[PDB]
Structures are given as C-alpha cells and as structure tokens.
Amino acid sequence: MEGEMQRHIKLTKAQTTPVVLVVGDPGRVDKVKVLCDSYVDLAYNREYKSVECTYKGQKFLCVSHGVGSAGCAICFEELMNNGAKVIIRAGSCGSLQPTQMKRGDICICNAAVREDRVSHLMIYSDFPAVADYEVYATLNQVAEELKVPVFNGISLSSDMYYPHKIIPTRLEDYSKANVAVVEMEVATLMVMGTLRKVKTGGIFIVDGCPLKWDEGDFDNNLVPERLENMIKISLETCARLAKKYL
Amino acid sequence: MEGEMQRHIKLTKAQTTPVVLVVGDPGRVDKVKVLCDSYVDLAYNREYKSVECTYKGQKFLCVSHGVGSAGCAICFEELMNNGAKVIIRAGSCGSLQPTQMKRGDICICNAAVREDRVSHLMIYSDFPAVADYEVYATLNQVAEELKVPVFNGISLSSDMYYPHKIIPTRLEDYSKANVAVVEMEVATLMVMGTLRKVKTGGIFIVDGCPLKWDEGDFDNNLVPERLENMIKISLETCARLAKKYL
Amino acid sequence: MEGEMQRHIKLTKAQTTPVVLVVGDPGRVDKVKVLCDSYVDLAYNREYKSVECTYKGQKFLCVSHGVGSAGCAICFEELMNNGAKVIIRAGSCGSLQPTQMKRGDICICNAAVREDRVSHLMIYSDFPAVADYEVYATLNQVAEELKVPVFNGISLSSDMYYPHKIIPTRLEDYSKANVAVVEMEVATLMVMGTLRKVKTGGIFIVDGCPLKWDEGDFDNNLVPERLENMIKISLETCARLAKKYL
Amino acid sequence: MEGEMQRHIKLTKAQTTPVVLVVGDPGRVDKVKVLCDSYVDLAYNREYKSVECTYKGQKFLCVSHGVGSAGCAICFEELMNNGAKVIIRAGSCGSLQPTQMKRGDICICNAAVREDRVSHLMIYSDFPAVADYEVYATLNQVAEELKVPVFNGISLSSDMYYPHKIIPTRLEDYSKANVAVVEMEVATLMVMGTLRKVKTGGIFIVDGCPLKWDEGDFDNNLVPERLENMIKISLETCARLAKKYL
Amino acid sequence: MEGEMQRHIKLTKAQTTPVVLVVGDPGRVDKVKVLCDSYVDLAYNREYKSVECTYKGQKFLCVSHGVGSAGCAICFEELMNNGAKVIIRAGSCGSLQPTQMKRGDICICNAAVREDRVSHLMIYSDFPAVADYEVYATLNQVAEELKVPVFNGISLSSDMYYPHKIIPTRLEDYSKANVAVVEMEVATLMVMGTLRKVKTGGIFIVDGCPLKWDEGDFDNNLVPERLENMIKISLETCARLAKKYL
Amino acid sequence: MEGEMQRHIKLTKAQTTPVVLVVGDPGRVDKVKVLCDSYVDLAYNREYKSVECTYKGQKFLCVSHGVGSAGCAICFEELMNNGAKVIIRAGSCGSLQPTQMKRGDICICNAAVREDRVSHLMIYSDFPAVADYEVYATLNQVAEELKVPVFNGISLSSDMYYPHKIIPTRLEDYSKANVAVVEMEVATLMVMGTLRKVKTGGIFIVDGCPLKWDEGDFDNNLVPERLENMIKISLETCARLAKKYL
C-alpha cells in the first residue's frame, strides 16, 4: 500500500484540505507557518513546499507554486486533482498606479489580464480571468475587521518579467486601462478555477514599482509588517472559508 | 441656449442620474416605468428610449440600448459621457446549463466572455470583462431579501445570434467551460465600465434554450412574473445604489 | 392559424418582398415612406420598423435595423429567412477622404472593411466583404440618370464609434489605404449576402467628418435635399430591381 | 544614358502601357501574342516575360508573373511603379463548385479570399480583396458580345497548392461559403491595386477540380478553344480599356 | 560593500561562469554535483539552486530554473545579465515518437516549438526557436565519443502539462509534424539566447509517454544509469565548451 | 508508356537525384551548370528550369524555383514527391547587419523567420523553421576547406519585397533580434523539409542592403567572384552529400 501522490507536489487526497493558501516562494511557506497556531510539514519537492496550517481552529494547506504561470499551473491542477475547493494566491506585486498604490499597500484582486499561455491552452482568449466573488468578498471583510486599509482592482498577470528591446510591454497600456497591479500567476489560477469549479482569489502586497518612481529596499524583504498584515488577512480568510467547508 | 445633448440618446448631463438601468428593448422601458413610483419620459431617438424612474424614493434612468454590442456601446459611452457612475444591464438570456438553469430562472452575472469586436477595439483580448463587485453584491443581496432564487455565473456575450454553416459557434465549448448564460451586450458594458471607472453589472432572465432541450412559448412575452421579480430586483438595486450616490 | 413571424422584425414570408431597402434609424423609415407612391405600415418591434413601399409601380420593403453590426445582423438574417433576394443599405457615413468627399456628398459602395465580429463568426477574416456587382451597377446607373454626382469606394465598417485612450483606431490607416467612407453595418450585410446568396449593396450620404476638418450642423438633420437625392436613388434602384424579381 | 528599368521585370516607364494583361506562365505570353494583330518582344528576366501586344488597334503589354503571390507581387508592384493604370490577371483555376462549374468553364472574378501573406503585409486582414468594378463590368460585356458563356464569382487565392497532413485546407469551407474558383494570385493583385489606385480584375478558365469529381487530361494543355475564348475576351477587354487610357 | 546579486538566482557576475548547465529540479543540482570533480554551493533562493561544478579541469555552474517557461525565463535572463555565454538545458521529456524513442532514450535538440508566452513577448511568432549549432554539435560529438546512442530532433516546449476538456492539445499534431519530444522550457531559452547573443542547447532523457503506450515506473526516479549517461554527456560538453571560454 | 512527371517542374522520379541544389533565377541554372564537370539539361517549364549536374564525380540536380514562397513551395513539394532527400537553397539576400555583413559577404543559414503564408498552411506558427544540422555543418566545413570566409545566422524569409505606406515592415525589428540576412524562400523550404523528412539548408550572397547604407551596382550581376565562391561551396557541398546518398 502506497500513499498515492500527485506527481509534482507529492501530496495525497487525504492530506489535501478543502482550502489551500498558495504562495510563490517556498521560503514564504516557512514564514506563513510560524504565524499559525500549529503546523504539520507535508512535502517538499521541486519548488512545491507543502504544510498543513492550523489557524483559529481551522486546518488548511499552505503550498508554494514557484515563479510563473506554467509552473504554478502544475501546482494548481494537482491541488484541484486532490479535491481543493478554495485556492487563494497570496503574494507580491508591482504597482501599475504608482501615484495611488505604493510599496507596502495591499491589493485584493477580483480579476486579471491573461498575459500567459497556459490559460489560452485551456480556453479561448475571450474568456474572463475572474476571482470567485465569495472569496474576494471574504478577503475584503477580514481586512475591514482587522482595520487594514486595502485597494481593490484587476491584476496584470504577465509571463514577462525582464523586457526585451524589440517590442513594447503592455505595462503602461494596462495602467491606462485602470489595471491596479502586476504579477505572474493569478490569471492562470482564476481561469483554471472557473473551468474546474474551484473557488479562487488573490491578495497581494506592493513590493515593486515597475513603471517608475520610487523606492528603496530593493527587496525581497518585501516590507515587514505590512507584509504581516497581508499574511494575517490571508490566514484569517482561509480559516473563515475552511469553516464553510467541513 | 440649448440643452446640450449626447448625439444618439439625446440626453443632457443634467438629465442623467448617477445610476442608470439599461434594457435592450425600447418596449421594456415602458414596462419598467409602470412598476416605479413615478416617471418622467425624457427622449426617444433611434432605439434609445429614456425615462427617469422614481422608485423607493430614489431617482435613476431607465434607457434602452437596442440589440447588439456596437449599438449598445454607443448608448453606454454617451451615458458615461453624461456622468453615469453605475450602469446595470437588465435583460433576457439563453441558458448554457440547461439541466440546471431553465426558462424563468434568473442569473446575476459577475463576468462575461468577450465575443464582440468593440471591446477589442478598446483593449487587448487578454483583459477581463468583469462586473463591479459592489454592483454584483447588491443585486444578490436584494434578490435574497426579496426571497427570489437566483443563479450566479459568467455570461457569454456573442455578436452572433443566427449560426452559419461553415464554422461552429462556441456555445457548447463555453457550456463545458461552466459559462452560465448567453446574451449579446454585457461584456461590452463591463469592459467599457472598467476602462472609464463606471461601475457595472448584469441581471438576466432565461427566456431561451439555444443548446437544446425545451420549451414553449416561443417568446418574447418572456415569462410573466418571474420577469416581474427580475425587474423588481433591478429597480430595488438601482434605488439602493442611487442612495450611495447623492 | 397564426401569421408565422421572424422573432425580431415580426414579419412573415408573405409580407416580405424580394427587394428590401434597409436603414439604421426607425425614424428614417417614416421619412422614406413619405417619398413613395403609397405604403403599408407592417410591424414595429424593438428597433425594427417595417413598411411596404410602393414606388414607381413596384413593391419593396423599407426596414430599420438599428445601430451596429450585431443588431443589424439579426434584421438581415431574418429578412433572408423570409426570402429577401436583394437588400440595399441606405445610410449616413463619415468621410475618410475629407479633401475629396464632403458633407452632403453621396458614396456608392462596392466593398467594405470588416471591422466587426459577427462576419468573423460566419467566415474567416480572409474572406472579402463585397457588394453584388449588379446592385452596385444599378445604383450608379440610377444616380447618373438622375444627374446626381456620386463617389464610388470602399467603406470601413467599424463597431467602434467612440475611441478609447489606449489603442489607436484604424481610421487614418484605412484613409491611407484609399477607403472612402466609414459607417457601422455594410460589411456585415455584404458577407451574409454572399454566404446566403442574397444580393446586397450600399449607398451613403456624408454627414460626418471623423478625421478632422469641417463643419456645421452637428447633425442628424444630415443634410436636407442631398439627403432627398440619396433616398430617391435608393428608391428608384429598389424599384428597378423589384421589376427583375416578380 | 541608360533605359532605367524595374529590377525584376526589366521594363522602363516608356515601355509600359496604361493597360497590362498578366499571365502566370511565361509560355502563355507566346501563346497570347500569336492571337494579337502584332507584337514587340520586350524583356525576359527570371519568370517575367514581357511583350507589347497590338490588338484591335490598341497597344497594351502582356507580362508573365510566375506562380504564387510573393513572386507575382514583385511583377505587379514594378508594373505599377512604371505607370500601369489597369492590370487584368488572365489564368487557370480550380472549380470550387464542381456540380456547376466544370473544366473549360470561364469565371470572371469580382473579389477574392486573401489566403496569402503579402497582402497582409500591406494592410490588415479586415480589408477586402476586390476587383475594380469597371474592369469586371468590361470583361462581362465583352464575353456577352462574343457569346461566350461565363460564370461570375469570388476566387480563393491560396498560397498552398499541395496539402499537408496535419491541418486541413479551407477549400471545402470556402466552397460552402459560395466561393466559385481557386487560384494563387488574384487577391494579391486586387489589394495592391486598391492601395495604389490601379484598376484590376481577373478572368480564369477551369482546368482543375481540386475537390473531387472529374476529369481527364491531366493538364496543362488546359483546354484548347475554351482557352482561346478566355484569351480573346481578355485581349478584347484590354483593347477596350486601353482606348479609355490614351 | 555588497556582492551585487541578480534578484532571483542571487548570484553575482563574479560567481557566474561563461558556461552554465541548467536543470529544472533543484534536487537535480545535488545529483549533478556529486558526479563532478569538486563543487562550491553558491546560492539557493526560491526554486533557483546554484553550484559551481569543476569537471575535467573546468569550472561551470549548475543552476536550477524550476518548472515552466515564465519561471525559467527569470533564471535565464539573470544568468545572461551576469555574463553567461553558453547555457545548456539538461532535462526530462516525453516521447512524441513512441515507436522510435522510448523511456531511457536520450534526445539532443536543435530547435523547438514555441508553445509559451514569454518568447512571444520578446519577439513575433514567426521567429525560430533554435539551438546554437556549435552547442548542438558538441553534445552530439561527446555522446558519440562516450558511445551513448542519442536521437536528434525538435522539442515541443508547451506551457500546458495537464490537458483540459474543451480544446485539444497539439501533442498529436506535432508528432505528425515529426517533433521528437515534449518538455516545457527549451524554446524560451533558445529564443532568449538568439536575442541576447548567448549560445544555447538542450539534451533530454525520455521519462514520459504522454501519447500513449507504455510504461512503468511512474517516475521521477526517471531512469537510473541512462540518466547518468545524459548527465555525463552534459558535464563533458560543458567542460569542452568552458575550455573555449577562458 | 509515358515518363510520369511532376505537374510543374516536369521531372520524373528517375530523373531526380537524392541531392538537389535550388536557385531562384532560371538564368542561375545555366551559370551553375558551366562550373560543373558535365551536365544534362532536363526540363524547362514555367520558372522551373532543371539540369543534372556532375561535379567532383557526383550527380545532383540544379533546379530553379522562381521568386517567392508560394511559387518555390510548388518546386520543393514536387522534388520531395520525386524522392529528393537533401535540398539546398543557394541564393542572394539583403544584409540585416549592415555594419558587419556587406555586399559580397556569404551567409550560411541554420534557421529562418517564417514571414510567409504557405508554411502556416502546413503547420502552426509556433513551429521552428530550421535547417538540417548536417547540411548546415557540411556547407561550413566546405567553406572552411576552400578558405572562403562565411557568416552564420538566421534568415528573415519575407513575402514582401516592396513596402507599402500604412504598416511598417519588420526588417528593423528583426535586425534588432540579431537576424543576419533577408530573402524570400528559405523558411518555406525548411519547414516543408522537417515535415517531409527531407534535409535542407541555405547559403546566400549579400547583394542587397535594404536597411540603408551602401552601394553600387544596383545588381543582379550580384557580385562576380564572391558569387563564384558561394556557388563552388554549394556545388562541393552537394557532391559531398550525394556521396552519402548512393
């Protein structure tokens, strides 16, 4: 008898909770778990590190997915294979509204620009990348109760981090179209969610200013403390939803 | 001195309320207005019929936009030109989930498939067609308070009503992708909304079964009564939002 | 026993003549009909107003189709469903050759740029939007006999009326490509025509200068008189063709 | 002092008539010229063979362009560079309506499907490939006077002659869309014509049945005699138009 | 004074050798390094694990890049930022020629299908994904000297691992087009290489049969021994090239 | 009994050697053949002129294909139909690296940009246009032995020779992407090769400076002597490969 695991994340159905918090950095999993009530280390294969969190009485996984849409898609498909019903991406982003949203600001995302490939391999470009509206609402509610100021908006999910010389990026064009922030994974998660009837959402902390003006600190110590707040919102939200899902 | 009107809808800024309810049929405007507390007929040009509704103490317009994305886009741009802050499309749709959603069922829509052209003339296909999440939430809340059962889902907004022989439609493909309903305008409204910082949403009554099995009654007497309920939700929602917008 | 009607235009086969004149504005139907020998009001549903014209001994319909490709496509499919053999669009346009074609000038169109969606839902982009060459020839002949000066050229049929900020329109690019005028429907009509073996064409009066320089009068009183001439050419052409079609 | 020639066809402005008949096969130039009143051999470089025809009192060139859109485009650009005002393609095609149009039948073409690349390098796919309507009308008129039965229709201009195994051709799809015939050059000519204000058209003899059923004779002796008729129509048309162009 | 590192891989220019071997699995770095003469652990951040290999007298890095095109692109851009002149991807693949290439077989790749997004964000789809031909030649030469049988061919680089229900994958289509193997990263590497004047190539071991028939062993213990051979070829090749690059 | 020929090139299987040298200009065939040991004129139909070369003891064809991708594709498909195993394109090109590669310089090409249509009619754009690496290697080896300096690089294969006014060419963009040279046929050959398991490659002499600066001599006397060298490399390479293929 074997524990029958998913190929890449190496988790079984039985280890997989209804609710899963996903992060990009495997190093983020260890930081998240220290803020929980208790945890159980599960698996660490490739970039896919898995813990069971207990937080505010509730069990849910935290799982790292790596950088970028194709790599994270493998994580997300395998979690959904294992029965996940709710997946929330918690991460860093760049601000596309640099006068309004600065380093440290937190953005809760209802939808995303699909500048990947894998979503297009699932379904036609016309199809919207959209959060589940209960998951989005819950993140907002929790942030309000914790008195943590948040922005809401669309994310640009772009497979390109480093620009080349020949053709422009769409960072400015999407800023003009009122897209809030930019990162690399949430469109892929949202589309796959809708397609597989798994509820998804996204919360992000601004740690990058890819347009222009401002700041610092270089990174990824992100920012402290504003970072803690975003993680707490994430954990509180995951707990509230795992209650729905017993 | 002239009252300075928008070219097609023939309304002035001063006549345009923060909240506007949009319908496809100019004949629907007259049906909506009879369910209000009071109304003022405004203008009727081309397919664009305009009334000011008073309902539950609040003023907001009801405006017809005609069939199809390019024609309704003219309506919507001109309303936004005049200062509309909230536009809600209330209409008929076909069911893409015919085992689950039948004639008479009401669907409140958070997002849409962009099978138009004009949204693509505004912004790249990758960009999501998405409702404002406050508008979506308010429609749901009102429906719950009125004890009217509702579905939630994505709409396919397709410029094609009558299929041709050569290439398939994507009606089945989008059904498989868990798209709830199909109509012809809401993607165009949602994208333009996001682009112009105008809050939008969509509520629809199933009056068509474009896949296959079922029913009737032919149309558009729609259905009575279930129709009344959808209109009431619309009107109640518009009132609740116009309160926010004094 | 019912008179079995098309869903949107509400006309029966028996009411539908071989030749149909289509206009955008339902208000235009009433203006056209006053210039005929006699008429019979048929139906008025949504933006679709229908009259039978008698002009110079011949019977043919005048039918309004509303603004924009998806809405007019419903009109045109339903007319073709009812046996129409010839459909001519008579309308307003903008000049893309503003030094050459001014307000009041009339353009008879042999082909169009397909900047819609619905034609692309019928057939691949490579396929030409083209008038029937008998219909085009007849409009020219009638104009010559009536000593009304006309231009000939390609129309840009664009689903976008109001530009957005992010991506350019192709109005200038198509001007450089020697496209004469711009409107919103005739490409859709032409493609559907070819596909369904229905003869089509387009005549337009310049009432807009969307590039730049010039003029006036704002609109849509169009222009008088030059407007009358375009309508007369339309009516004379429809009569000449209905003779072919007894 | 040099006679300043175009790079590929090696003709000067002074040698280039307002009207030019173009054929694919350089061997066709020699066959055409024997049916004229008199000729002057001009140049033969690469696949580009050039003669001045005199026919029915009028001078015009016959020029070979080779097989396929990119090669013929070089011919056509260089002729237009030299002042050609009218270019007519006279050639062979396959029947896409094999019940209606058989080997030997002649088709006069008003428009074409753009299944090339070079037209797309000139202008967006939405733009129609269309004959000048005077050139099309003249071919028809001449055929009628010569009592030669002709078909009229759209041509599929396809860069692919030999199909591969992986993706289908659009031969059947375009047959279903009522495209008459298939060849390899006329879309490219038509678009370039419109773009450069040069009047174009196409007449073709069915020598191929690429769908299926029928026939023979293998080719390219084409067919005799029906072939002569198509060439005569071509020559007569070229003469009639060169008269317009003194 | 800081050692100035690349953001994600956390390596400095001074730590970065002209030649770099890239692998997907950070666990593969530890397996590679045990087969070298000596090593120096450098950095481990996110999925990016870095060692300096010494093998056969020569120094070159081995660096993990994670699963999938967008994540690995960050690795590759940062290595090129640091002066890498040669990057070779050594990994696992699936066989697209399952009668010819089986589990354990090794394929040296000269080119790839670009089924990513990020390469398309760099340059137009028309642009070829191609290995440097010296790097490809060297891998072949080394394999021949080591008497290790190898296949040569094109790789399909696909961002999709798990298929969805709505639209087909192109795995079969590309098999029919004589594509050898399928993996997820090498197209992205090849294009970026050409664009930045960095020499690239790919060697892969078949550990997957995504079409159909065959086998086993499940994975990723890959296969032993055939795996060792592929790694040895990789290491020998890297050494031979680092000699060129002192 | 007939010698059963391919439709356009008019060659039989028995006349077709394993190795074929292809040139654009039928006039080039006569120039090539004079540099061989002996030849046999085979066929001359349309732009397709065919000779059997004997050079350095070996037999292989030289065949002209005309200008441009669709016309040459017919040549290449028919040669492959007849059993050709190796086809090498030898021709002229323009320099896209005008500081580095000048008139007279010779470029041996491993890959190409697919700016045709016919390759896209065979297979999806993502698929690479790539030379066989043995053919590429052999051209290089022969050039080295003959002490003829050569460049190596990617070719832009573009169906457009004469630019139009509306949309830019990609000549500069591809120069920035490190594409070496530009011509009109080799991408089409490479893709078809891979698809049909026929080994291909390309060698070119710079006779054009389509960017800008420089030179002369106008053309196509190309250049002497540097031209002879490129032809000799071609012939030597063809001989070396025909030896492999007895």
Which 3-state string (H, E, C) describes C79-119? Answer: HHHCCCCEEEEEEEEEECCCCCCCCCCEEEEEEEEEECCHH
Nearest to E235 by CA among E48, E37, E92: E37
**Number of helical H runs and strand E runs in chain B:** 7, 10
* Contacting C residues, span 94-123, partner chain D, CB-CB under 8 Å: 110-115, 123
Percentages of chain C per state (helix, strand, coil), in multiples of 5: 30, 30, 40
- Cα–Cα dist F238/F242, whole Å: 6
CB contact under 8 A, A133 and B125: no
CB contact under 8 A, A73 and E7: no
B30 is catalytic: no
CB contact under 8 A, A159 and E47: no
Chain D residue numbers with beta carbons less than 8 Å from the beta carbon of F169 are 121
Amino acid (1-letter code) at residue D15: Q
- Cα–Cα dist F160/A191, whole Å: 39
- Out of C128, C173, C179, closest to residue D154 by CB: C128
**Residue found by looking up tokens 């803690």 in the block:** A228
- Cα–Cα dist D91/D31, whole Å: 13
Residue A24 among known ligand-binding residues: yes
Nearest to F218 by CA among A149, A178, D6: D6
- Six-digit token string for B5: 């009107």
Which residue in chain B has the smallest CA separation from E167?
B173
Q: Are F167 and F173 in contact (CB under 8 A)?
A: no
The kind and range of the H/E element at B20 are strand B19-23
Percentages of chain E per state (helix, strand, coil), in multiples of 5: 30, 30, 40
Enumerate residues 6+ apart whose C-beta is below 8 A from A148: A106, A229, A230, A232, A233
Q: Which residues pair with F42 in a beta bridge?
A: none
- Six-digit token string for D206: 């069915």
Q: Are B81 and A101 in contact (CB under 8 A)?
A: no
- Cα–Cα dist D28/D44, whole Å: 13
- Residue positions of C annotated with a catalytic role: 207
Q: Which residues pair with E93 in a beta bridge?
A: E206
- Cα–Cα dist F244/F237, whole Å: 11
Identified catalytic residue from A105, A116, A207, A214: A207
Q: Are B222 and B109 in contact (CB under 8 A)?
A: no
Which residue in chain E has the smallest CA separation from D168?
E173
- Cα–Cα dist F206/D11, whole Å: 24
Distances (CA, A) of D34 to A199, D27, D49, D221: 77, 12, 15, 16
Q: How far is CA F85 from the centre of its chain?
A: 15
Per-residue buried b or exposed e for D192-230, using 16+ beta carbons within 10 Å of the residue's own CB? bbbbbebbbbbbbbbbbbbbeeeeeeeebebbeebbebb
Expressed as residue numbers, the domain containing C10 is 5-246
D vs F, Cβ pairs < 8 A, gives 148
Query: Subunits with at least 3 CB pairs below 8 A relative to chain F?
Result: A, C, D, E
F1 touches D at CB < 8 Å: no
- Cα–Cα dist E104/E209, whole Å: 11
Listing DSSP states for E175-235 in one string gives HHTT--EEESSHHHHHHHHHHHT-EEEEEEEEEE-TTS------SSS--TTHHHHHHHHHH
- Cα–Cα dist A205/A105, whole Å: 6
- Cα–Cα dist E194/E185, whole Å: 15
Q: Are F180 and E197 in contact (CB under 8 A)?
A: no
Which residue in chain C has the smallest CA separation from A171?
C166
Side-chain-facing half-sphere of C175: CA atoms under 13 Å: 16
Side-chain-facing half-sphere of D104: CA atoms under 13 Å: 10
Count: domains in chain B: 1
Q: How far is CA D134 from the centre of its chain?
A: 16
SS3 A26: helix
Q: How far is CA F166 from the centre of its chain?
A: 31
Chain E residue numbers with beta carbons less than 8 Å from the beta carbon of B177 are 166
Chain D residue numbers with beta carbons less than 8 Å from the beta carbon of C118 are none
Enumerate residues 6+ apart whose C-beta is below 8 A from D221: none
Residue A225 among known ligand-binding residues: no
Nearest to D112 by CA among F71, C127, C116, C193: C127
The kind and range of the H/E element at D70 are helix D69-81
Q: Are B111 and B119 in contact (CB under 8 A)?
A: no
Rounded to a whole number of angstroms, the distance from the CA of E164 to the nearest CA of chain B is 9
Which residue in chain A has the smallest CA separation from B137?
A133
**Could you count the other beta carbons within 10 Å of the beta carbon of residue E163?**
14
CB contact under 8 A, A164 and E8: no
* Greatest distance between any 2 Cα atoms in chain D: 58
Nearest to A154 by CA among B126, C122, C154, E228: B126
- Cα–Cα dist F33/E96, whole Å: 42
- Six-digit token string for C24: 């955008």
Q: Indicate the length of chain C as a whole number.
A: 246
Q: Indicate the length of chain A as a whole number.
A: 246
Q: What angle do CA A17, A23, A24 make, to 5 degrees?
A: 140
Q: Which phi and psi (to 5°) does residue B96 adopt? A: -95, 0
Enumerate residues 6+ apart whose C-beta is below 8 A from C246: none
Chain B residue numbers with beta carbons less than 8 Å from the beta carbon of A123 are 173, 177
Rounded to a whole number of angstroms, the distance from the CA of E41 to the nearest CA of chain A is 18
Chain A residue numbers with beta carbons less than 8 Å from the beta carbon of E69 are 68, 70, 117, 159
How many Å is the Cα radius of gyration of chain D?
17
Listing DSSP states for C134-160 in one string gives HHHHHHHHHHHHTT---EEEEEEEES-
Q: What is the DSSP letter of F78?
A: H
Q: Which phi and psi (to 5°) does residue D23 adopt? A: -130, 160
Q: Are C95 and C102 in contact (CB under 8 A)?
A: yes
Q: Are C19 and C238 in contact (CB under 8 A)?
A: yes
- Cα–Cα dist B79/A152, whole Å: 25
Enumerate residues 6+ apart whose C-beta is below 8 A from F32: F21, F23, F51, F53, F62, F90, F231, F234, F235
- Six-digit token string for C144: 């010559």
The kind and range of the H/E element at F20 are strand F19-23
**Residue found by looking up tokens 């988790």 in the block:** A11
**Number of helical H runs and strand E runs in chain D:** 7, 10
- Six-digit token string for C228: 């009358």
Q: What is the DSSP letter of A189?
A: H
Handedness of CA B222, B225, B228, B229 (dihedral sign): negative
Q: Which phi and psi (to 5°) does residue F136 adopt? A: -65, -45
Alpha-carbon dihedral angle through residues A223, A224, A226, A229, given to the nearest 10 degrees: 140
D195 touches C at CB < 8 Å: yes
Q: Are B177 and A127 in contact (CB under 8 A)?
A: yes
CATH number, domain containing residue C191: 3.40.50.1580
SS3 D77: helix
Residues preceding gaps in chain B (C to N > 2.5 Å): none
Q: Are A46 and A34 in contact (CB under 8 A)?
A: no
Chain B residue numbers with beta carbons less than 8 Å from the beta carbon of D175 are none
Identified catalytic residue from E105, E116, E132, E207: E207
Q: Are E6 and E82 in contact (CB under 8 A)?
A: yes
- Six-digit token string for A204: 């992000």
Per-residue buried b or exposed e for C75-111, using 16+ beta carbons within 10 Å of the residue's own CB? bbbbbbbbebbbbbbbbbbbbbbbeebebbbbbbbbb
- Six-digit token string for B192: 């333009």
Amino acid (1-letter code) at residue E62: C
E221 touches A at CB < 8 Å: no
Residue A80 among known ligand-binding residues: no
Burial class (CB in 10 A: 0-12, 13-18, 19+), E211: middle
Pairing of strands A58-64, A19-23: parallel
Burial class (CB in 10 A: 0-12, 13-18, 19+), D152: middle
Enumerate residues 6+ apart whose C-beta is below 8 A from C144: none
CB contact under 8 A, E167 and B177: no
B vs C, Cβ pairs < 8 A, gives 148
- Residue positions of F annotated with a catalytic role: 207
Q: Are D230 and D106 in contact (CB under 8 A)?
A: yes
Interhelix angle C226-244/C26-33, rounded to 10 degrees, is 80
Handedness of CA D10, D14, D17, D18 (dihedral sign): positive
- Six-digit token string for E26: 């950070």
Mutate one of A8, A10, A46 to test the E interface: name it (highest E CB count within 10 A). A46
Q: Are A112 and A187 in contact (CB under 8 A)?
A: yes
Interhelix angle F133-145/F226-244, rounded to 10 degrees, is 130
C66 touches B at CB < 8 Å: yes
CB contact under 8 A, A176 and C167: no
Assign residue C140 a region (left: φ > 0; alpha: ψ between -120 and 50; beta: otherwise): alpha
Listing DSSP states for F42-63 in one string gives EEEETTEEEEEEEETTEEEEEE
Rounded to a whole number of angstroms, the distance from the CA of C44 to the nearest CA of chain B is 10
Per-residue buried b or exposed e for A68-90, using 16+ beta carbons within 10 Å of the residue's own CB? bbbbbbbbbbbbbbbebbbbbbb
Interhelix angle B69-81/B186-196, rounded to 10 degrees, is 30
Rounded to a whole number of angstroms, the distance from the CA of C204 to the nearest CA of chain A is 33
Distances (CA, A) of E201 to C53, E36, E196: 74, 20, 14
Per-residue buried b or exposed e for A56-67, using 16+ beta carbons within 10 Å of the residue's own CB? eebbbbbbbbbb
- Cα–Cα dist A193/A123, whole Å: 12
Distances (CA, A) of B41 to B19, B44, B86: 16, 9, 20
F169 touches D at CB < 8 Å: yes
Per-residue buried b or exposed e for F63-83, using 16+ beta carbons within 10 Å of the residue's own CB? bbbbbbbbbbbbbbbbbbbbe
**Residue found by looking up tokens 């908006």 in the block:** A153
Q: Are B156 and B180 in contact (CB under 8 A)?
A: no
Nearest to B188 by CA among B135, B120, B237, B139: B120
Enumerate residues 6+ apart whose C-beta is below 8 A from B171: B96, B156, B158, B182, B210, B211
Mutate one of B125, B176, B178, B179 to test the E interface: name it (highest E CB count within 10 A). B176
Identified catalytic residue from D37, D207, D214, D217: D207
Chain E residue numbers with beta carbons less than 8 Å from the beta carbon of A69 are 68, 70, 117, 159
